[PDB]
Amino acid sequence: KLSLQDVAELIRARACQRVVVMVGAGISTPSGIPDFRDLPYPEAIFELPFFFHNPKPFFTLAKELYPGNYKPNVTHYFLRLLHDKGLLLRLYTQNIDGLERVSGIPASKLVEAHGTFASATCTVCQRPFPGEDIRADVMADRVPRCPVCTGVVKPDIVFFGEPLPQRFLLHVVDFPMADLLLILGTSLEVEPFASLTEAVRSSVPRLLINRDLVGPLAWHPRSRDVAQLGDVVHGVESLVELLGWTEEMRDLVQRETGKL
Amino acid sequence: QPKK
Numbered sequence: 001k002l003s004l005q006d007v008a009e010l011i012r013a014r015a016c017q018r019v020v021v022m023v024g025a026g027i028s029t030p031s032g033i034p035d036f037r038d039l040p041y042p043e044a045i046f047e048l049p050f051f052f053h054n055p056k057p058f059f060t061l062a063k064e065l066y067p068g069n070y071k072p073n074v075t076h077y078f079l080r081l082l083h084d085k086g087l088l089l090r091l092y093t094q095n096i097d098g099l100e101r102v103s104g105i106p107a108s109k110l111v112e113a114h115g116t117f118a119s120a121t122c123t124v125c126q127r128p129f130p131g132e133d134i135r136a137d138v139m140a141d142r143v144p145r146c147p148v149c150t151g152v153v154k155p156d157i158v159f160f161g162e163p164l165p166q167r168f169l170l171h172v173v174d175f176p177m178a179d180l181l182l183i184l185g186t187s188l189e190v191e192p193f194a195s196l197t198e199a200v201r202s203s204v205p206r207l208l209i210n211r212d213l214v215g216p217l218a219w220h221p222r223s224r225d226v227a228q229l230g231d232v233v234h235g236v237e238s239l240v241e242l243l244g245w246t247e248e249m250r251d252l253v254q255r256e257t258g259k260l
Numbered sequence: 261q262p263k264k
């Protein structure tokens with residue numbers, strides 16, 4: 001079977017230079033954002049009917065999560081280095097913390113499958129707003145209201161049962177184009193984002209860096225799956241060492257600190 | 261449309 005070593009060599013030799021990446025909340029727990037894995041059940045927080053009933057739970061999360069609150073960690077910066085080396089085809093994220101773009105990965109490389117706090121939309125009149133526009137209220141524990149119609153202004157977070165963003169559809173071209181799939185810090189429980197793991201070609205290495213073997217990687221392993229189980233930062237640290245990128249990662253991380 |  002393939003090892004982590006083997007995958008690192010594939011990258012370092014540019015045998016794989018169209019890497020697709022899937023990430024989840026696991027990659028942002030090092031940043032200090034807890035993962036998942038009145039509020040009547042957890043899922044309520046992303047349910048539109050509940051939100052209309054009581055938007056205060058969501059907004060408490062939005063306040064916790066709002067850009068500026070958290071800094072990207074070495075996992076993000078690794079993915080940024082992947083981009084910088086011109087190896088990243090696309091990074092698909094279930095996260096709504098926005099730490100991918102804060103790390104400096106261009107929006108063309110990102111698919112933010114569950115939406116963004118960078119923008120907002122009035123729930124009544126559909127007026128769009130910059131996320132900065134509602135920041136004061138959200139942070140001041142107010143529910144932001146539309147100037148035009150008084151309707152609740154809701155971040156462009158994709159709620160359960162709502163259409164995934166346009167850019168999600170990129171998966172039809174991305175996954176079959178990928179010569180490596182990297183899966184980081186996802187339980188792969190959330191469809192339809194999960195089953196994307198199956199959408200790379202039979203020949204394509206799939207590298208999981210996660211606490212645990214999850215999803216189709218567990219039940220339906222393929223010949224060239226690699227599992228690096230443990231802390232995600234330890235995993236990436238290990239990958240970066242094998243890649244010989246440690247000095248490049250320092251340089252990058254040092255440069256990027258200022259922005260934050 | 262693909263929905264979450």
Ligand SMILES: NC(=O)c1ccc[n+]([C@@H]2C[C@H](COP(=O)(O)OP(=O)(O)OC[C@H]3O[C@@H](n4cnc5c(N)ncnc54)[C@H](O)[C@@H]3O)[C@@H](O)[C@H]2O)c1
Nearest residue numbers: 024025026028035036037095096097185186187211231232
């Ligand atoms: N940061 C965020 O944006 C955030 C925060 C929490 C929840 N969520 C939701 C989670 C859900 C998508 O599911 P998914 O992304 O899989 O999250 P999840 O919480 O369902 O699963 C995360 C996975 O990462 C694993 N994990 C967590 N921390 C580490 C670590 N340090 N090292 C290794 N493995 C680790 C964890 O064991 C699990 O397998 C959507 O509803 C998101 O909105 C997002």
Ligand SMILES: [Zn+2]
Nearest residue numbers: 122125146149
């Ligand atoms: Zn309005």
